[PDB]
A paper describes a structure:
Aromatic residues cluster in the core of folded proteins, where they stabilize the structure through multiple interactions. NMR studies in the 1970s demonstrated that aromatic side chains can undergo ring flips—that is, 180° rotations of the χ2 dihedral angle (Cβ–Cγ axis)—even when engaged in stabilizing interactions in the hydrophobic core. Here we capture ring flipping events of a buried tyrosine residue in the SH3 domain of the JNK-interacting protein 1 (JIP1). Our data therefore suggest that the conformation of the aromatic ring at position 526 is determined by steric interactions dictated by the size of the surrounding amino acids.
To study the size correlation between the amino acids at positions 493, 517 and 541 and their influence on the conformation of the aromatic residue at position 526, we carried out a principal component analysis (PCA) by assigning a size score (n) to each amino acid according to the number of heavy atoms in their side chains. This analysis reveals two well-separated groups, with the SH3 domain of JIP1 belonging to group 1. We therefore hypothesized that SH3 domains of group 1 have eclipsed conformations, whereas group 2 have staggered conformations. To test our hypothesis, we determined two crystal structures of SH3 domains of the scaffold protein POSH (‘plenty of SH3 domains’), for which the first SH3 domain belongs to group 2 and the fourth SH3 domain belongs to group 1. Consistent with the PCA, the crystal structure of the first SH3 domain of POSH (POSH-SH3-1) shows a staggered conformation of the corresponding tyrosine residue (Y172), which is stabilized by CH–π interactions from L163 (position 517) and T185 (position 541).
Residue numbers in the entry: 134 to 194
């Protein structure tokens, strides 16, 4: 089956171990929605957290 996923609208990264780094246009697999403001997702087997408003959902969780 197709995994939940989203397209990055903007670049993101951070200095916390858990921040997911990505560029605008990247396709991110969604793994968990922490709260209204944060997802856990992954790109290329690298996991981390990022803001919900920085992506456009393709397939929801």
């Amino acid at each position: 089956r197709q995994l939940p996923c989203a397209k990055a609208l903007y670049n993101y990264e951070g200095k916390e171990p858990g921040d997911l780094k990505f560029s605008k246009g990247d396709i991110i697999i969604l793994r968990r929605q922490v709260d209204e403001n944060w997802y856990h997702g992954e790109v290329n087997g690298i996991h981390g957290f990022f803001p919900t408003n920085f992506v456009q959902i393709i397939k929801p969780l």
